[PDB]
Design a protein around this ligand. Structure first.
Ligand SMILES: [Zn+2]
Length: 635
């Protein structure tokens, strides 16, 4: 082992015993010390937090005047990582103070951690809202902000991805002023474009790290869900096999765990969780009867968790050292049945800051937190003439307010393009009236319309009311367990066009309108409407029905490859070109069309194979809702 690494760290890691010269940790540390940003796809069982901890703590131990900044999604994960690294600081013995700076920290120590904390953990919302606008009170952080750590990079996508990219633009701008360009260390999971997603974020050409421990078994069956998973778990427990099941929604967890718990507890005799009891359960699991919290012997799932990365991660939570283990049951849903009938995405792998509205919002924010100068750029967005129409307002531009409640950041809620959008309030029980979700204008028109069928994470809901003039959905949770809208459209421009074999493929910008019309399951509804300018990638009555079938195929195939919500983008003679339309949901380009521009060839090939190998008769209700081969030979 090279003696370049600090011997304090070497001995502290030799105490626990993980001194193995490992592959991905080596490739990460070497080329992070070299100065190149990295993105890793290593699982939790292999490397986990150490791959980004080790270079950070090495730089902290070398020069005491070094600071690190972490991006973790929630306050619970912030506290978890803080405790995990505080344990290693304790084993190291070096006077290093690392804390979290989020909404639930004691104010008596906030100034302290601003003046003396080495590592600072903070979620993007709190970061953007408080830390960067008051970067003055963070001088000591930004003068020596060497590294920037990001956990779960795939969560930063869509509107959240664009907003976080703009926040990191502001962050790098502040660092440029304070003279401390940081190298970026991003962690993620199994996605199709890990390096391509890491490059566009910060505009840095970071490298991706892909790299016996036995072999893990895979299950590909479907019973003709809760009770069946319970029976599988009870078989494993009768055989005395360490088993883990994965229910996501807390309510489903409580129900299934009540079943399993009464049974097994009579046999054997998340968010709201705290780090003390978390470490107690870790102790129990890894050195008792029932973060390296422990290693499981078999993994049981509960449907496709709506993410390629999340499924692989929850599968990788289990594993042994030089041993074998086993890995999912679908439900009465075409999406889970589809991911069952499509295991071809497992042998290997299976967004746009150019949105001008978010650009204007973050321009206002940056102008508040740091004055601009038009004489330098790396190649990002900074056209000064556009940066100069932001002027006064006689009778939205800037708000030169001398009051205190008004703010430039104000309503710029980056979690879901919440310029002005709806907030969801659960009216099931008054005691703890749970305010849960938030949704854009058009997204709420599509989903949260009054008296709808809302499904929020395996739990059924029912919309009671929607205050549209103040954007507030009031819903009711149901245990007894569709929608529609259509109107005209207009076009703008095309920045990417084709002419291949009569079938021209265009990508550009358009402007659409809205109208709720009716909803399915059988009722009409009206709501005030507004236009929407965004990017879009696109290409007698029997032909209209054929195009409707094509639209069904696309609506059921596109969310898979783009890995987004099913109700993000929406599929549509056209007056633009005289003959007969994917468009982005949220105002402005969000990559949901440029990714289609990139991968439309493979999308069309997969559509061919899907419409051919569908277990039906020339079209299934889950794919179309000899027309099959006619569609095939037309496309
Ligand atoms: Zn079919």
């Amino acid at each position: 082992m090279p003696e370049s690494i600090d011997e304090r760290i070497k001995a502290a890691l030799s105490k626990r015993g993980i001194d193995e010269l490992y592959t991905h940790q080596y490739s990460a540390f070497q080329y992070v010390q070299k100065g190149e940003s990295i993105v890793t796809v290593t699982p939790t069982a292999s490397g986990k937090t150490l791959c980004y901890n080790l270079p950070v703590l090495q730089s902290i131990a070398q020069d005491e005047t070094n600071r690190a900044l972490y991006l973790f999604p929630t306050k619970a994960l912030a506290q978890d990582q803080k405790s995990e690294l505080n344990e290693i600081i304790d084993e190291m013995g070096i006077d290093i103070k690392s804390f979290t700076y989020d909404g639930d920290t004691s104010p008596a120590i906030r100034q302290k951690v601003r003046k003396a904390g080495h590592i600072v953990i903070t979620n993007p919302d709190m970061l953007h809202s408080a830390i960067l606008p008051h970067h003055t009170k963070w001088v000591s952080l930004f003068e020596n902000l060497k590294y920037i750590v990001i956990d779960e990079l795939h969560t930063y996508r869509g509107v959240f991805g664009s907003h976080v990219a703009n926040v990191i633009r502001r962050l790098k701008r502040i660092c440029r002023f304070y003279g401390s360009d940081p190298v970026f260390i991003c962690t993620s999971a199994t996605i199709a474009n890990p390096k391509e997603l890491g490059e566009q974020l910060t505009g840095k050409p970071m490298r991706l790290v892909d790299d016996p421990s036995g072999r893990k078994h895979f299950v590909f069956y479907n019973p003709p869900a809760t009770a069946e998973v319970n029976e599988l778990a009870k078989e494993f427990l009768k055989n005395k096999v360490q088993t883990i099941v994965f229910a996501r929604s807390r309510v489903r967890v409580e129900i299934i765990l009540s079943h399993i718990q009464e049974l097994v507890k009579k046999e054997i005799g998340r968010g709201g969780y705290l780090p003390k009891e978390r470490r107690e359960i870790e102790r129990g699991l890894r050195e008792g009867d029932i973060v390296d919290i422990g290693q499981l012997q078999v993994c049981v799932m509960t449907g496709y968790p709506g993410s390629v990365a999340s499924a692989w991660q929850q599968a990788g939570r289990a594993g042994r050292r030089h041993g074998e283990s086993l890995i999912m049951v679908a439900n009465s849903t075409p999406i889970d049945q589809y991911i069952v009938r499509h295991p071809e995405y497992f042998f290997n792998r299976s967004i746009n800051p150019e949105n001008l509205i978010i650009l204007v919002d973050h321009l206002k924010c940056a102008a508040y937190e740091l004055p601009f100068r038009a004489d330098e750029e790396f190649g990002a967005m900074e056209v000064s003439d556009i940066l100069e129409y932001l002027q006064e307002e006689a009778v939205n531009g800037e708000r030169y307010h001398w009051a205190s409640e008004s703010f430039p950041a104000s309503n710029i809620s980056l979690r879901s393009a919440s310029q002005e959008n709806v907030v969801i309030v659960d009216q099931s029980d008054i005691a703890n009236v749970r305010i849960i979700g938030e949704m854009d204008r058009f997204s709420a028109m599509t989903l949260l319309h009054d008296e709808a069928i809302y499904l929020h994470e395996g739990v059924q809901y029912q919309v009671e009311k929607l205050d549209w003039d103040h954007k507030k959905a009031y819903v009711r949770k149901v245990d007894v367990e569709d929608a529609n809208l259509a109107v005209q459209l207009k076009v703008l421009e095309i920045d990417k066009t084709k002419e291949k074999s009569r079938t021209s493929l265009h990508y550009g910008d358009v402007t659409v309108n809205a109208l709720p019309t009716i909803f399915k399951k059988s009722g009409p509804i009206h709501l005030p409407e507004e236009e929407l300018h965004t990017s879009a990638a696109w290409l007698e009555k029997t032909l209209e029905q054929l195009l409707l079938g094509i639209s069904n195929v696309l609506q059921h195939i596109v969310p898979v490859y783009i890995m987004c919500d099913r109700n993000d983008v929406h599929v549509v003679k056209a007056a633009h070109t005289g003959l007969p339309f994917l468009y982005d949901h949220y105002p402005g380009g969000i990559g949901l069309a440029e990714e289609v521009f990139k991968r439309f060839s493979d999308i069309n090939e997969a559509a061919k194979q899907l419409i051919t190998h569908c277990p039906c008769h020339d079209g299934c209700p889950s794919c179309i809702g000899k027309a099959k081969e006619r569609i095939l030979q037309l496309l």
